[PDB]
Amino acid sequence: QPSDLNPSSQPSECADVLEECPIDECFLPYSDASRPPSCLSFGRPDCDVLPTPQNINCPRCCATECRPDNPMFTPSPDGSPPICSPTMLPTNQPTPPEPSSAPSDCGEVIEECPLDTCFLPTSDPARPPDCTAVGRPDCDVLPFPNNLGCPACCPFECSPDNPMFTPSPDGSPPNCSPTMLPTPQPSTPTVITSPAPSSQPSQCAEVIEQCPIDECFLPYGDSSRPLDCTDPAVNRPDCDVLPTPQNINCPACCAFECRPDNPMFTPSPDGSPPICSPTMMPSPEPSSQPSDCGEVIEECPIDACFLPKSDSARPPDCTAVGRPDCNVLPFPNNIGCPSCCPFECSPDNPMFTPSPDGSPPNCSPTMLPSPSPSAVTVPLTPAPSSAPTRQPSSQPTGPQPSSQPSECADVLELCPYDTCFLPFDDSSRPPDCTDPSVNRPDCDKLSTAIDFTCPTCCPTQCRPDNPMFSPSPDGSPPVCSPTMMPSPLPSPTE
Secondary structure, eight states: SSSSSSSSSTTTTSOSSSSSHHHHHHTTBSSSSOOOOTTTTOOOOOOTTSSOOSSSSSSSSSOSSSSSSSSOOSTTTSSOOOOSSSSSSSOOOOOOOSSOOSSSSSSSSSSSSSSSTSSSSSTSSOOOOOEEEOOOOOGSSSSSOOSSSSSOOOOSSSSOOOOOOOOOOSSSSOOOOOOOOOOSSSSOOOOOOOOOOOOOSSSSSSSSSOOOOTTTTSTTTSSSOOOSSTTSSSSSGGSSSSSSSSSSSSOOOOOOOTTSSOOOOOOOOOBEEEEEETTTSOOOOOOOOSSSSSSSSOOOOOHHHHHHHOOOOOTGGGTTTTTTTTTTOOOOOSSSSSOOOOOOOSSOOSSOOOOOOTTTOOSTTOSOOOOOOOOOOOOOSOOOOOOOOOOOOOOOOSOSSSOTTSSSSOOOOSSSSSTSSSSSSSSOOOOOOTTTTSOOTTTOOOOOSOOOOOOOOOOOOOOOOOOOOOOTTTSOOOOOOOSOOOSSOOOOOO
């Protein structure tokens, strides 16, 4: 490395050396690669004549004369340490100072030779080691011996406290900014979407983190509380005892037991709406008064009179029935008042709106209006009703006799009185035409305008519920009416 930017070789090209016209001053290190041409391509023999004019022609080429055969190509990043002109006049940039790197990180940049100059930063991916570090004690010396031991590892000393091991940018908490912001895994403080417990008091009081309290670690049955110490939780069975003695082997964990109710109540960081127990004691049945509009607020009537007035219109206000004694708001009740309240308060005090929803109290109960106007909105001026007004008419059908037991026995309609020849409910009178199929299956439902030519048999069928089987020879002879053969129309019988 020494004799670095000091060219120890200059007298070679021109009878001047340590000073050649090219350099970046010319246009790049000249012998870089494909820099602007040595003037002949522009035909400029004026350009960069021995000194450097750039005040005559010079479009953009560099160097004429100076050295033997000034046009040159076939490049090289080391073609020429300057040897002819550039040094003629002193003050040519040698180099800035030595330390290009100063304490800025934490300990990567602290006079430490490792940096990357060795072979990468020491803690990067486990770079080639520090020699002695593998067994090269020859290379324990800072100046590189490279004359016996050193394979290709780095030496030692350099700066105070030289033992170092453990690489990887993430091998350890690097500190000095990278590690500044903690983000724990159990209790992650990033945003925190809702309280940690999303399910605890789902029964009432069973599963409610029944152990921590800040005295142990973290809020009253929060959820995010440390492990229960005892081995299944971490490794501390000493803290098995729920009431934490503190003076025992509880390092950073909380007490055990916990789950099935041993001694505690109240979970979550901020608790919860206490419907399960802390609410049992306070019980204000009347916790509000104005449900009326403006009368139920320390007004002369109130339930204090007798019931919330609008109930069923509570007992009258004395003068209201004729007790002017009680008209005096200060209540006498030693003169009149049989069982009533006073009067006045404001002109004409007793009456309005009983039945809580059986009247429109208004100004709270009745608030949402739904009166009557549906398809009708006629204040004064009418409108020709034209709506889908479909509504059938209630019209029954079926002849309903409103008098039956009226003639003699049971019936009244035209059909009865013995002339069927004996009562049907006797034992057996002339057959029922249709029923056993004897002569006339046609003589069935009374007849009317069909015909009446039923001869040998009796139609019988008159009176709802007329079929019978096993008549009654000791029942009751219905000769007076329910018996006769129906005979619609006088019937000429021809």
